[PDB]
Design a protein around this ligand. Structure first.
Ligand SMILES: CN(C(=O)N1CC(c2cc(F)ccc2F)=C[C@H]1c1ccccc1)C1CCNCC1
Ligand SMILES: Nc1ncnc2c1ncn2[C@@H]1O[C@H](COP(=O)(O)OP(=O)(O)O)[C@@H](O)[C@H]1O
Ligand SMILES: [Mg+2]
Length: 330
């Protein structure tokens, strides 16, 4: 039930000049990804995996958004909760996929930049879709991050990255949690989106100077909650609440990342039908337990590299993402 898609990134500039051969091949029409394990394009051994969707190196940000995000956003707009994880080794495109980047030399505006990823596209699109049809709504975003099992708020502009947040069990709705002090910022309109993201980027820079390899070891959960009051052309007012969680996971390569370790164990217990699922052994899995065998529709995007130097990690990533397909939720 949990949908898993794989995204291979293209070779970089240093890999083009070194005339690198790709050990990965994608077949989108067949939802298949094949990896060269033995060696030689003349004769070789290979490993194949089938997923729900596979995107090769030529896949652009707009292809990812239209194919995977648009339908998930529709569901969120219907009043459901959805979560999208980005899993893969550092350098394979987790952040590029979830957030995207700016094209160099101020070539475009943020809302037209083709390098934009899921988060900016999603936020710009929520306003583009609800502003049209008569729907009163409010958008709240939150950015919670985890480093060495400590919680941080990367959007609060009056607290620094040395102030960790506290987490408690929610006595109201079971298997849910309360994060003391997590700031929820209201996004009044599309033109307010970009600076919110800029502020987050800037605060992440300070977190990076204070914590070792922060961008590689931290987990980031960017949540966008949409409170809606849709009035059809008749006079029916549908009050709906939808929440989308965009999770950029810590690099999967192999000191100890308790949340990453626990995520793997939670998935293993879920697909092996084990009665006890270790949700509580890490903050990530407690915060997102409804996304792992719960009532939230979730998808995983496994990012990989086509370079032969990353063979072991690419296989580990694919193998991990393949097992995830067997998780059932809702
Ligand atoms: C804001 N920014 C980005 O590239 N960003 C940062 C970013 C982002 C930042 C966060 F905290 C949390 C979630 C996010 F998604 C995504 C983009 C973006 C925004 C609109 C169009 C294309 C890409 C600056 C980062 C620092 N260099 C200049 C660009
Ligand atoms: N699909 C892609 N197309 C073009 N460049 C990419 C793609 N994916 C990743 N890259 C590039 O690869 C590098 C790895 O980026 P990043 O997203 O930060 O990786 P990660 O978050 O997995 O550690 C960046 O310089 C980025 O611009
Ligand atoms: Mg990263």
């Amino acid at each position: 039930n949990i949908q898993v898609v794989v995204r291979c990134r293209p070779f970089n500039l240093a890999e083009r000049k070194a005339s690198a051969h790709s050990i990965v091949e994608c077949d989108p029409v067949r939802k298949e990804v094949s990896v060269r394990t033995g060696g030689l394009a003349d004769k070789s051994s290979r490993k194949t995996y089938t997923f729900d969707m596979v995107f090769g190196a030529s896949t652009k940000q707009i292809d990812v958004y239209r194919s995977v995000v648009c339908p998930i956003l529709d569901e969120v707009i219907m009043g459901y909760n959805c979560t999208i994880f980005a899993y893969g080794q550092t350098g394979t495109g987790k952040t590029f996929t979830m957030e995207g980047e700016r094209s160099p030399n101020e070539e475009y505006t943020w809302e037209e930049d083709p390098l934009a990823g899921i988060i900016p596209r999603t936020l710009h699109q929520i306003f583009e879709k609800l502003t049209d049809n008569g729907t009163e709504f409010s958008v709240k975003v939150s950015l919670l991050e985890i480093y060495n099992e400590e919680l941080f708020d990367l959007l609060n502009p009056s607290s620094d990255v040395s102030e960790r947040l506290q987490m408690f069990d929610d006595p109201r709705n079971k298997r849910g949690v309360i994060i003391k002090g997590l700031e929820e910022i209201t996004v009044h309109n599309k033109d307010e989106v970009y600076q919110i993201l800029e502020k987050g980027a800037a605060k992440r820079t300070t977190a990076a100077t204070l914590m070792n390899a922060y961008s590689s070891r931290s987990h980031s959960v960017f949540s966008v909650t949409i409170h809606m009051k849709e009035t059809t052309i008749d006079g029916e007012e549908l009050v709906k609440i939808g929440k989308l969680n965009l999770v950029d996971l810590a690099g999967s390569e192999n000191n100890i990342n308790q949340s990453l370790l626990t995520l793997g164990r939670v998935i293993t217990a879920l697909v092996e039908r084990t009665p006890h699922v270790p949700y509580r052994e890490s903050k990530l899995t407690r915060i997102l337990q409804d996304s792992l065998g719960g009532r939230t529709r979730t998808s995983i995007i496994a990012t990989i590299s086509p370079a032969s130097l990353n063979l072991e990690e690419t296989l580990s990533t694919l193998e991990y993402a393949h097992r995830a397909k067997n998780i059932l939720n809702k």
